[PDB]
Specification:
Rossmann fold; UDP-galactose 4-epimerase, domain 1; seven-stranded parallel β-sheet; two-stranded parallel ribbon; 9 helices; globular; binds NADPH dihydro-nicotinamide-adenine-dinucleotide phosphate; EC 1.1.1.133
Length: 273
């Protein structure tokens, strides 16, 4: 009842739970993936969601829950909307009743990727439905006293660095999208969010890694671990349904001033196996 973490069972949520539990009374919500001491709750059951919030009385809600499979979002748009956008409306509504501090997690895929180095005030223009559903959630989350944290390429037990490590280790070819983003480990992102909490920051804030291409990232991890298997850069990845933004890197300069911790230097040790 200090802090509700939705998406507690996901990459960011696991790490948030670990760190917040130090200081810090934590309510951990999962749906499909059971976690120790968690509460099972489907955020698309809106009355059950609102009741849960009003009953548990979190001082703080961190909304990390989402449908993050980009290609699945492109086909199952109704499902993506309900969790990535509409649930946020209900989190905000119930939160307001208890005057909770709402921290909502968003994505670099809200941008069209034609510019890169996006700052907080740059205008979203998503080119895939994951990005659009998330942008609609941002829109519901926009409140005088809420905080939207946009991030990029969260990695822990999944995300691109893991796909690279597992694929190359088995001698297979990695097809690396020609384009940039700003990958941050779940643990570094969690550490930043903890700092932000104490501060009761409001508005929008970018918290992500250094700008890097998928190709360089893949080859760094190949070099790091002398992995076999080839890295091939491709203009378009075969099998992809959704279009990815060319350069969705974020400009996190504001957060770099605010926060003490280096959340941005590439953290490959944040990979989980
Ligand atoms: N992953 C990435 O590359 C990036 C992610 N983001 C954003 O960061 C946040 C965290 O992402 P990440 O940790 O990687 O995502 P994960 O895919 O690892 O976790 C998704 C979480 O959402 C929960 N969830 C999904 N649907 C529901 C639902 N219907 N009801 C309750 N919980 C649900 C899942 O719970 P369960 O498994 O228990 O069902 C899981 O805890 C998200 O907001 C994401 O959009 C932003 C930029 C990059």
């Amino acid at each position: 009842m200090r802090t509700l973490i939705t998406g507690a069972s996901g990459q960011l949520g696991i790490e948030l739970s670990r760190l917040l539990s130090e200081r810090h009374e934590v309510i951990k919500v999962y749906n499909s993936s059971e976690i120790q001491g968690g509460y099972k709750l489907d955020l698309t059951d809106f009355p059950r969601l609102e009741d849960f919030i009003i009953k548990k009385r979190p001082d703080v809600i961190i909304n990390a829950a989402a449908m993050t499979d980009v290609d699945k979002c492109e086909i199952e748009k109704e499902k993506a909307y309900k969790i990535n956008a509409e649930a946020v409306r209900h989190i905000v509504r119930a939160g307001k009743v208890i005057d909770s501090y709402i921290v909502h997690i968003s994505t670099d895929y809200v941008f069209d990727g034609e510019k890169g180095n996006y700052k907080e005030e740059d205008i979203p223009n998503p080119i895939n439905y994951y990005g659009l559903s998330k942008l609609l959630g941002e829109t519901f989350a926009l409140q005088d006293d809420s905080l939207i944290i946009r991030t990029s390429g969260i990695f822990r037990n999944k995300g691109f660095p893991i796909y690279v490590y597992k694929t190359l280790k088995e001698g297979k070819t990695v097809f690396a999208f020609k384009g940039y983003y700003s990958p941050i480990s779940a643990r570094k992102l969690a550490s930043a969010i903890l700092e932000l909490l104490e501060l009761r920051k409001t508005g929008i804030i970018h918290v992500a890694g250094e700008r890097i291409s998928r190709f360089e990232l893949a080859l760094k991890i190949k070099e790091k671990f002398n992995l076999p298997g080839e890295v091939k850069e491709v203009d378009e990845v075969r099998g992809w349904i959704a279009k990815r933004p060319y350069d969705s890197s974020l400009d996190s300069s504001r957060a770099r001033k605010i926060l003490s911790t280096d959340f941005y230097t590439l953290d490959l040790d944040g990979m989980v196996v």
